[PDB]
Amino acid sequence: STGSATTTPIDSLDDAYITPVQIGTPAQTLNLDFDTGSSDLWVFSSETTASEVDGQTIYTPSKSTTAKLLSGATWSISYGDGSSSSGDVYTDTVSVGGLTVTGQAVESAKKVSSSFTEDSTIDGLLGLAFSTLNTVSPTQQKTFFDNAKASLDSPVFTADLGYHAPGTYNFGFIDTTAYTGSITYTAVSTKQGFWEWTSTGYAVGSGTFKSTSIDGIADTGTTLLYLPATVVSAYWAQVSGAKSSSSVGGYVFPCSATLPSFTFGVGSARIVIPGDYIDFGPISTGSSSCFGGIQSSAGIGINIFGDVALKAAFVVFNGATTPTLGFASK
Numbered sequence: 001s002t003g004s005a006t007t008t009p010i011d012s013l014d015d016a017y018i019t020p021v022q023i024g025t026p027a028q029t030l031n032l033d034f035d036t037g038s039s040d041l042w043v044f045s046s047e048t049t050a051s052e053v054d055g056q057t058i059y060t061p062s063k064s065t066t067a068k069l070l071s072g073a074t075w076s077i078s079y080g081d082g083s084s085s086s087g088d089v090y091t092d093t094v095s096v097g098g099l100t101v102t103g104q105a106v107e108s109a110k111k112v113s114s115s116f117t118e119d120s121t122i123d124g125l126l127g128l129a130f131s132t133l134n135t136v137s138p139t140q141q142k143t144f145f146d147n148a149k150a151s152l153d154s155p156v157f158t159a160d161l162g163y164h165a166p167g168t169y170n171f172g173f174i175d176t177t178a179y180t181g182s183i184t185y186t187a188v189s190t191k192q193g194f195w196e197w198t199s200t201g202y203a204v205g206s207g208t209f210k211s212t213s214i215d216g217i218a219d220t221g222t223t224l225l226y227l228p229a230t231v232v233s234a235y236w237a238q239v240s241g242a243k244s245s246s247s248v249g250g251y252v253f254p255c256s257a258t259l260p261s262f263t264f265g266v267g268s269a270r271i272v273i274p275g276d277y278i279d280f281g282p283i284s285t286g287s288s289s290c291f292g293g294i295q296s297s298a299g300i301g302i303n304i305f306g307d308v309a310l311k312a313a314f315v316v317f318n319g320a321t322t323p324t325l326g327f328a329s330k
Contacts, residue, residue: 001099001100001148001151001152001153001172002098002099002152002153002170002171002172002173003095003096003097003098003099003148003170003171003172004097004098004168004169004170004171005019005020005021005096005097005168005169006019006020006097006166006167006168007019007034007161007162007166007167007168007169008166009162009164009165009166010119010121010122011121012164012281013280013281014161014162014163014164014223014307014311015223016033016119016121016122016221016223016307017033017034017161017167017220017307018031018032018033018121018122018123019031019032019033019034019096019097019126019169020032021094021095021096021126022093022094022095022096023043023059023064023092023093023094023106024059024061024063024064024065024066024067024092024093025064025065025066025092025093026064027095028057028059028060028063028064029057030043030044030057030058030059030123030124031057031121031122031123032122032123032124032125032126033122033124033125033126033221034125034126034128034159034169034220034221035125035126035127035128035129035219035220035221036127036128036129036159036194036195036217036218036219036220036221036317037080037127037129037194037195037217037219037220037221037222037304038077038079038125038127038129038133038221039127039128039129039130039131039132039133039134039135039143039193040075040077040107040125040127040133040134040135040136041094041104041105041106041107041124041125041126041127041143041144042075042077042085042087042106042107042108042109042124042125043058043059043106043107043108043109043123043124044056044057044058044059044109044112044116044123044124045058045059045060045061045087045108045109046058046059046060046061046062046108047087047088047108047109047110048087048108048109048110048111048112049110049111049112052111052112052116052117053117054117054118054120055120055121056120056122056123057123058123059106059108059123059124061090061092061106061108064092066092066093066102067090067091067092067106068090068091068092069088069089069090070088070089070090070091070105070136070139070141072138073088073089073105073136073137073138073139073141074086074087074088074089074136074137075087075088075089075107075135075136075137076135077135079221080222080300080304081115082113082115083113083114083115083116084112084113085109085111085112085113085116086109086110086111087107087108087109087110087111088107088108088110089105089106089107089108089136089141090105090106090108091103091104091105091106092104092106094106094144096126096144096169096171097169097170097171099148099152099171099172101144101147101148103147104144104147105134105136105141105142107136107141109124125221126144127143127144128143128144128145128157128220128317129143129193129194129195130143130146130190130193130194131143131146132190132193133193133194145157145171145317145319146319148171148172149319152171152172153172153173154172154173154174155172155318155319155320156171156172156173156174156316156317156318156319156320157169157170157171157172157317157319158170158174158175158178158314158315158316158317159220159310159314159315159317160175160178160179160314160315160330161220161307161310161311162311163274163276163277163311163312167311174316178314178330179313179314179328179329179330180328180329180330181328181329182269182328183314183316183326183327183328184266184267184268184269184326184327184328185267185316185318185324185325185326186198186266186267186324186325186326186327187324188318188323188324188325190323192217192302194217194218194219194302195217195218195219195317195323195325196215196216196217197215197216197217197218197325198213198214198215198216199213199214199215199216199264199265199266199305200212200213200214200265200266200267200268201213201214201264201265202214202227202231202262202263202264202265203262203263203270204234204235204238204260204261204262204263205238205260205261205262205275206260207238209263209265209270210234211265214227214228214231214264214303215302215303216297216302216303216304216305217302217303217304217305218305218310218315218317218325219304219305219306219310220306220307220310221306222304222306222307223280223293223306223307223308224280224293224294224295224304224306224307224308225262225273225278225293225294225295225304225305225306225308225309226295226296226297226300226302226303226304226306227294227295227296227297227303228296228297228298228303229296229297229298232251232294232295232296235260235262235294236251236253236292236294238260239253239254239257239259239260240254240257241253241254241257242254242257242292244296245289248283248289248291250291250292250295250296251291251292251294251295251296252283252289252290252291252292253289253290253292254288254289254290255281255282255287255288255289255290256288257290258275259275259276259278259279260275261273261274261275262275262278262294264305264309266327269327271309271312271313271327271329272312272329273308273309273312274312277293277308277311277312278292278293278294278308279292279293280292280293293308294308312329313327313328313329313330314327314328314329314330315327316328
């Protein structure tokens with residue numbers, strides 16, 4: 001089997017991407033944030049504290065003839081950005097782009113933090129990291145991909161995120177029309193539960209490539225590119241007037257700037273992030289200070305190849321017995 005679903009930016013900055021997901025019988029379609037940096041499929045629901053719901057579409061398990069309470073199971077998750085959610089668990093039928101999994105754990109939120117409430121466009125998350133990170137207790141649950149894998153034509157999914165445009169998540173096949181040139185594959189460590197890999201270096205604009213190993217995670221659920229302070233300083237030094245602002249929470253730059261590109265290495269291959277992808281717009285409405293899309297990972301504890309990086313590539317998440325990651329230009 002295979003599946004193919006379009007993923008759509010939630011706003012004009014590509015802050016996140018939503019993908020429609022069918023849950024239950026009859027189908028309830030929710031727009032979920034597919035997150036290769038976590039491993040829980042959780043939804044706003046009829047159980048979510050009413051004051052914490054503001055415009056989201058909810059899953060109502062009592063209206064699904066295939067829903068079953070997973071008795072005694074609870075979940076609770078905290079994300080890198082400080083947001084969180086928790087609740088109980090149902091199993092139900094879940095379909096993505098025509099690919100159906102029966103008995104998928106659907107984690108129903110009883111509580112969500114303010115950032116989730118305030119984002120009316122995201123109805124929940126669909127985790128695509130390794131199932132070892134799943135938070136369900138006392139019986140850990142599998143991700144949608146893990147459940148689907150054996151049925152797939154090939155044990156892979158691909159992320160093809162758009163810049164200010166829709167893109168695609170495919171399951172079970174590689175669309176050879178969706179990228180240019182060849183796909184370069186690189187080793188993955190699953191030791192921390194992430195799609196963790198090592199970039200071979202970087203360049204700023206038309207500058208020379210610096211060969212240096214940068215360990216990080218491919219994370220579709222993180223907006224920006226978080227890299228070591230040395231790398232990030234080298235980038236922003238090429239933008240007149242750019243500076244790190246403790247009050248704003250990262251590097252800012254004059255909105256009048258033209259940003260240089262940023263290149264990262266995948267083995268001997270190179271992925272080029274155009275400068276425009278690095279512009280996250282005014283820090284507040286009407287400001288002439290703009291927020292940068294490349295930020296320091298210092299104090300996160302891990303480098304993160306978030307959407308800014310991934311949307312410059314066609315990315316293969318290869319879930320074969322020994323997982324690997326593939327990147328192609330597009």
